[PDB]
């Protein structure tokens, strides 16, 4: 219910409260064990990082991958694509923005 | 201790203002407050201190030789 | 103020907390604007009436030097046109126009309280004062540098709407002072009383339990009458033990 | 009964001392301390108990004295502040000595639990010996 | 209250205040139960007050635990949870 | 009018006010006691306050002896304590009169539960201002703790606590058992169990006591006794070493 | 010794009712949430164990008691008031019954004696009435399975499926949600687990939930063989491992 | 809602019975009584209010006795203290009936304690507003207990109650440090007389009469005896010189 609601908070901007809808599911599907697969749990984590990039907070994105409590050992190609977007926001260059576009195009696009 | 002070509401603020006015001027000892009553029942930590009632002087009934001096 | 912060000793546990939530935000409010927080507005100090209440009232304004606004509960409830309304509003405006102002309330149980059934029979003045205090704080005009100190007999008998955060953020009990804190008090009021150099200040601390500057003056009253009987201009260190022991029987 | 407690200290101090100053002293603390220690009743701690440390000094290697000092603050004791006064004094004998005591001053900091862990509300001595350790590491 | 419904206040009020990456807001959610809007908002407010007491312009993890013990227990009364007598 | 707080009747809020005021009388003495269980035994420790120097430390006891096996721990005034003490010793004797074997642990808690109800159910009897705590070693389930409140309710407890500070003592006992995932403490000798309860007691309180300020009950298998002043002092010296 | 209050504490209110009984229903509606359902082949009884501390073992307290093992019971209300009813009901069902009829009482006969005992302390002076509500359901050789709802006033009422407790307002709709005459004994268990879960604010497992059903006569729970007339007790209390096994089938 | 003091079973919001607190006030309005606990025996001392010279000395004695081996003394109302001893004396014969042995101190301690705690439960009966002080010698030693109107009693190395208990408790604590081992029965009589004169400052409005009795092992051999002869005369002249 929060994942379907968090999508409605995308085109409406206001990403401050949109991260709570996505973070509520991460700990919810984590305790489901077999009920969640590897690919389904990977897409849920991508929603949290995508909401923070729209909110423009660099420190909160680095705390997700660095801290094991926030990461819970979930990593893939599409997850690393969100890190390249956050690094391109500080330097403000479209070269690194389109760099991860072609390589990660499978999962990213 | 009760909540029935609604009828005593005028009496309640009487003792409250007494504590307030005695704290206004602490440099004047020439204003004396004396209360002559039958006995003491309800106490208070606010009533016992400087500038207020402190020494309790009992007024018992006169003794054998005391009534002889009064009548004389 | 006429009473500094050295005569309120024994409350130093609370004194360290009160100075940081009152003296610190009043002298330098600009430190909170950088973080984005808000300082508390009111400070609720309850306890037994008459003990340390008069001292802490003048002690807050002494370490500051601002104006001391005293609000007696007797004059708050009267029969007039707009009585308690004009008292709080003009005080609210006088605190905004003049920043160095400290408001102190004494015995708010008369103007407060839950009563019994929460009905009103000649009770309209109780709700008149309480509703105005809560409405001025949550409005679009707050008090940044203004501190309001309230006192009552019991905290549980007041309005729970005020105790919630957003208006009154400070609830602090006033218990009896410790033994090490009553030594500094006994060196102040007794200093004005003429005595000798052999006077022992450690005689009372053993027999004193929760005796502030108000209770020690009763010991000086009994010691002042003793100097006339013995034809002396001072008192012996034994007069301190006999005077505190008499007070310890009536008090705690 | 009044001064008789402090008179029994110097009596074994005179006659014969060989290697036995450790057992003939610290064991006396177990007999006393039971009903004593009110205000002025101290005949040993803070006064004579500090003299025992002065007796154990200049006797054997400081490693044995450093271990016996922990046992005083281990079981019961009285006040850690009184022990902190002795620790400040031991640092003075080690400073005027030096020689092989350069590494001894480091072992005293780690062995005593007063410096490593919280004991009494006065920690002033805990940071005093710590600054001396910084001067050793900087060299 | 709910875990996310309370988190909506943490992610909002604390967004306007300076904090540190060491401080974690997840510990103040699950541990807290049945709190109003101002009580949770007072946690971020008291954390900033205690930081000024130590002269700090940010919010650390230690300042959260010091301000947590004050607002965690609103019930001092006894004789509760009584299904008997 | 004020008969709700005078005699025991159904209140508009569904609470008995007269009985609830008896619980506040348990904290008048300010005694915080915890009960822990070993492997085959159970050890309980209670606080002891001696305000007057003329008090005899041998006569003052907060932990009584019901029989050679089952003990009792009471927090509160002695007059309400002896009311439940005379019945507990009598009902334990009446059991072997009609049966002949030893009363189990959960049985004495039930016998005293209906008796404490008589005070609450009947208006002419006031409820006791004490709380009953029974610890012993059962012949089947082994160590067990049954703490009977004046309400007349009893249920099994892993490690319980009482007094105003019981909230701080309980928090210490929660973090210790969740790590070991066991209800009791596993130890062979019963002397080490005494040191285990003192460790959790000091950290919850934050102060130290002497041999005369504490009373340590010890319930072993088929035996029960109470440590004297010299035995409690030996436990404080033994725990001083190592930890 | 010489009780001086013989007057009843329950008096008629000026509104036309009894205050002591009306105020006793408050503790019933504020008590522990329980439920029961009567099927054709058996009766299911479920309740929730609410512990004020995590260190309190819930295995000692039994919220589902046993009078005679044709009938289960549960209390939505004061425990001590319920415990004295257990000792007295077993007495009138054995000393005053089994010593006469030489058998065990049915469901309708058991609620008749318990209802009279609850009123004894209500009318008598110097004693407080019973504010506990009981649910008594069992099997009969003729009328079959029958369930009753015992009020603290002493008036029982028959019910097919009833739930009383804190969430009793919303629980009655859940028992009236899916119901028919084709329900089984195990089919009512899955409904009981989903209904009770609505009122559980804490952990939900076999330890914190007490589930007891009334089935056929169990020879394994009897203890002897060779007598065909007695096949064993009908009442069976489920363990912690059996409750968790039926949770994955929901 | 007031009225908490109108019944014994009604508890105050703080959990303290008002009737119990009022029973202590009745003790402060009565004649004080002291006591001394020795090793081989116990010593009891109590004064008397002298209205005029019409009172005949050594006739009416507030010190009671339980069998021959136990003395008793109370401070408070006269009928309350004497009735409690009668219950203990009648039950003392029941103990010798079944058990054939004389009742010791620990068996006599719980004897009077069960009655006082029973009156607090029943609101229809009045509790004893007196402070009972009893003692004696048994097979295990000599013990001294002090009973309170609330039914609270424990071991006491000294017993002080009544109006003058404030100055009496200070002297009993000094005798412990002066004699940590024990005290003789003859010296305890002289020391108990000085304590009585110390509390006489409030009683100076009238005269005074001292009644001292003690029971020990090596002297009375478990027999309750009153101080008479030259032992009483030497004890009076010794305390009167030290008090002034």
Coordinates of C-alpha atoms in Angstrom, one line a residue, chain B residues 3 6 9, chain C residues 112-128 130:
Chain B
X3 CA -11.7 20.4 45.7
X6 CA -15.6 26.5 45.4
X9 CA -13.0 30.4 47.0
Chain C
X112 CA -6.1 26.4 37.6
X113 CA -7.3 23.0 38.5
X114 CA -9.6 20.3 37.1
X115 CA -12.3 20.9 39.8
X116 CA -14.7 17.9 39.9
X117 CA -17.1 17.4 37.0
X118 CA -15.5 20.1 34.9
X119 CA -18.7 22.1 35.2
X120 CA -18.9 25.8 35.8
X121 CA -20.8 27.3 38.8
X122 CA -19.2 30.7 39.5
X123 CA -16.2 29.0 38.0
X124 CA -15.9 31.0 34.8
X125 CA -12.9 32.9 36.0
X126 CA -10.8 29.7 36.4
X127 CA -11.3 28.8 32.7
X128 CA -10.9 32.4 31.7
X130 CA -6.2 29.1 31.8

